[PDB]
Amino acid sequence: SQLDCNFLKVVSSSIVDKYIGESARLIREMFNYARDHQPCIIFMDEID
Amino acid sequence: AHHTDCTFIRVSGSELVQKFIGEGARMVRELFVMAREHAPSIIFMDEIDSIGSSRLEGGSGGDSEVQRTMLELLNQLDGFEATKNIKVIMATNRIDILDSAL
Amino acid sequence: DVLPPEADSSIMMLTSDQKPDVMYADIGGMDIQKQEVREAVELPLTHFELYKQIGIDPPRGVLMYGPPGCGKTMLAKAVAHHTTAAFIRVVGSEFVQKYLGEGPRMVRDVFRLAKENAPAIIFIDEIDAIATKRFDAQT
Ligand SMILES: Nc1ncnc2c1ncn2[C@@H]1O[C@H](COP(=O)(O)OP(=O)(O)O)[C@@H](O)[C@H]1O
Numbered sequence: 001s002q003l004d005c006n007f008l009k010v011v012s013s014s015i016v017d018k019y020i021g022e023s024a025r026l027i028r029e030m031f032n033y034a035r036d037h038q039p040c041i042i043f044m045d046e047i048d
Numbered sequence: 049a050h051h052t053d054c055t056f057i058r059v060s061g062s063e064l065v066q067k068f069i070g071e072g073a074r075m076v077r078e079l080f081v082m083a084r085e086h087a088p089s090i091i092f093m094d095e096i097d098s099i100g101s102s103r104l105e106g107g108s109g110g111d112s113e114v115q116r117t118m119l120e121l122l123n124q125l126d127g128f129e130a131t132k133n134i135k136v137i138m139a140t141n142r143i144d145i146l147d148s149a150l
Numbered sequence: 151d152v153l154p155p156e157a158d159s160s161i162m163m164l165t166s167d168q169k170p171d172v173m174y175a176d177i178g179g180m181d182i183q184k185q186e187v188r189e190a191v192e193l194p195l196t197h198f199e200l201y202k203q204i205g206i207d208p209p210r211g212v213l214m215y216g217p218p219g220c221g222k223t224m225l226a227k228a229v230a231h232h233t234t235a236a237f238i239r240v241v242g243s244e245f246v247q248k249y250l251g252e253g254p255r256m257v258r259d260v261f262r263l264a265k266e267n268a269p270a271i272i273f274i275d276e277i278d279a280i281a282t283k284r285f286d287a288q289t
Pocket of ligand 1: 222223
């Protein structure tokens with residue numbers, strides 16, 4: 001309802017990996033994704 | 049290593065352990081084959097509690113693949129074939145934890 | 151032809167573009183520790199001749215030791231920022247992995263990358279899991 005309108009970012013599970021490299025890659029990918037648009041807010045639920 | 053012109057061949061402790069089954073024994077067999085191919089040689093297995101210790105009762109209650117690698121090394125050190133001009137140096141703390149075979 | 155060295159896929163090395171943002175002035179007055187960690191890591195690296203002229207073979211490893219939060223990781227970030235050599239930080243938790251042998255492989259690869267990338271400083275932070283005694287495992 002605020003001037004964000006961009007909420008969704010369905011949960012966050014894909015960032016699980018076996019080395020910090022893949023997690024850094026995925027997180028900067030999502031950070032650039034958020035930078036794509038107006039203030040983007042990332043749902044972080046679905047964790048166990 | 050620095051005074052003998054034999055052909056030193058290193059092996060760390062956690063280096064013959066490979067996740068894929070059997071790859072932890074093909075490596076030892078290839079090691080000794082290379083040694084035989086290289087005439088006088090000496091192998092200094094560094095801390096060797098890794099491929100060592102004592103055989104544990106099997107099942108899903110202990111390590112087994114490391115046990116198979118230990119067995120392969122044992123057989124190649126003294127088995128049906130008598131290795132010639134190959135000598136092994138093993139160093140490892142805690143002499144009392146090794147197996148009764150090695 | 152021979153191409154430039156490659157295959158730095160699992161590049162945990164900072165090497166610019168991820169450096170921490172702290173100088174040696176966002177840390178409040180840890181004077182003794184600051185001097186000691188400097189004389190352990192920073193001093194041997196730049197003023198190398200300052201050491202051999204005494205026959206020392208500078209120290210190669212330093213530990214951190216303190217209550218739950220006191221700035222251990224912060225001084226690590228600072229030393230990493232104000233440094234000329236590489237810097238790879240791997241926590242002592244990414245080593246206890248599932249598939250067997252895949253653990254020690256990570257240590258071997260970390261040190262191989264360190265040696266293959268010139269002078270380097272390897273930071274193993276919160277290493278309290280894999281350091282604890284012997285307790286000859288029968289399990
Ligand atoms: N003296 C200090 N100066 C600046 N920041 C500090 C100081 N002490 C604690 N902090 C802040 O508190 C946090 C505690 O970090 P630290 O205690 O090193 O982590 P750890 O629990 O791994 O030791 C740091 O991120 C830092 O931002």
